[PDB]
Ligand binder design. Structure first.
Ligand SMILES: [Hg+2]
Length: 149
């Protein structure tokens, strides 16, 4: 489900197969390091800093489901455990760096809950700037002073 965006042979961010679309942050330079995915036609959306396309039938079995359901508590992500509360995802400052955009924040059942775009450093912890699903529609939460990863 996770695929890496490469630029001049260097990993810039990530791309993710969520729902029936193929996502990757718009700000990420490079092209998805996967033939099938790279040749697709993406629809940019500067409001959401998102850039989606549709998953080829032969990879649709490889998508990851999403969900609007996110109760205060701890979520899972590649570098550890994210914490959700007050309508804000955070992590121990230092555990997320530039080049982590595109990485999904899963819950304990595997449902992708948000997609990291960058983070604002507010001391001990960094409030993440993510793309998250609302009632049905996509949304983007960007804490004051975010540094786009
Ligand atoms: Hg994914």
């Amino acid at each position: 489900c996770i695929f890496e965006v490469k630029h001049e042979g260097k990993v810039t961010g990530y791309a993710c197969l969520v729902g029936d679309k193929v996502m990757k942050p718009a700000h990420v330079k490079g092209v998805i390091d996967n033939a099938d995915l790279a040749k697709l036609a993406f629809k940019k959306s500067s409001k959401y800093d998102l850039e989606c396309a549709q998953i080829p039938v032969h990879m649709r079995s490889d998508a990851s489901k999403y969900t609007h359901e996110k109760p205060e508590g701890h979520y899972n992500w590649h570098h550890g455990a994210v914490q959700y509360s007050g309508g804000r995802f955070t992590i121990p400052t230092g555990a997320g760096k530039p080049g982590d955009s595109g990485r999904p924040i899963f819950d304990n059942k595997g449902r992708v809950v948000a997609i990291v775009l960058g983070g604002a450093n507010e001391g001990s912890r960094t409030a993440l700037s993510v793309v998250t699903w609302n009632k049905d529609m996509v949304t983007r939460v960007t804490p004051e002073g975010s540094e786009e990863w």
